[PDB]
Amino acid sequence: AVPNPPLPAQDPIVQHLKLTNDQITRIKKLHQQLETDVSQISMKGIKDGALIEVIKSGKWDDAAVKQQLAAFSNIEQQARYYRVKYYFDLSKVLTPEQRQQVQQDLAQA
Amino acid sequence: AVPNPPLPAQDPIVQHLKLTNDQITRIKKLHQQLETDVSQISMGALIEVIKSGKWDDAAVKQQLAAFSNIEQQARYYRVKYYFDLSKVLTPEQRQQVQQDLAQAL
Ligand code: NA
């Protein structure tokens, strides 16, 4: 699973790079946009505590569980799309050496 | 989403329940079944776009869809595990687990 990117000041993948302030400025803007984008993903699909209720009731509800998990799936697919695009866009401001570093750190995850 | 459950002795969800040996034995069996079931879920482009520097939208979406398809199935079994686990518990223990899981979402 693509990682949920920390703030660049907190992200070990970017902290490991010796980035110029211009590079950091650009990556910060990218991460800001990432958070803006993911914050717009609709979460209305999730019902608060749909799974706990099934467990609490003692009666298995195949349809309800599948629906809730499908809703989680849909949201995560979208969030991860933007997380992947972030690291892709991030790589564009890097040197070839820095880029190979990121690719290695990401493949590991 | 849904916790990926450790064995009972390591699972924070059930560590304060004061499970008996018979309860542990049965829950360990459920956990063994969970792992077997998850293992039988039929299981790249994300790295290639970074390496090539060329965005492949469809490839990225395809891989993410495949991964989420797996996760949906695995999480189904994980929810079922806690559901089945709860049957082994006393009413008080069940009440605790429900509250622990609700706290974990
Ligand atoms: Na672009």
State whether residue A47 is helix, strand or coil: coil
Whole-angstrom CA distances from B64 to A54, A73, A106, B11, B18 are 28, 10, 15, 28, 40
Q: A16-26: string of b/e by CB count within 10 Å (b at 16+)?
A: ebebeeebeeb
Q: What is the token pair recorded at A99?
A: 């880029």
CA nearest B68: which of A14, A78, A24, A26?
A78
Quote the ligand 1 centre to A73 CA distance (angstroms). 25
N- to C-terminal Cα separation, chain B: 6
| Method used to obtain the model | X-ray
Distance CA B44, CA A3 (A): 15
CB-based contact B1 A66, cutoff 8 Å: no
Contact A8, A14 (CB under 8 A): yes
Of B47, B71, B98, the CB nearest to A52: B98
- In angstroms, what is the resolution? 1.6
CB contact, 8 Å: A106 with chain B? yes
State the distance from the centre of ligand 1 to the C-alpha of A22, rounded, in angstroms.
Answer: 18
Task: Give the distance from residue A52's alpha carbon to the nearest chain B alpha carbon, in angstroms.
Answer: 6
Select from A18, A108, A32, A87 the least CA-distant residue to B51. A87
Please report, for chain A, how many H helices and E strands are present, in that order: 5, 0
B64 neighbourhood in chain A, CB within 8 Å: 2, 77, 80-81, 84
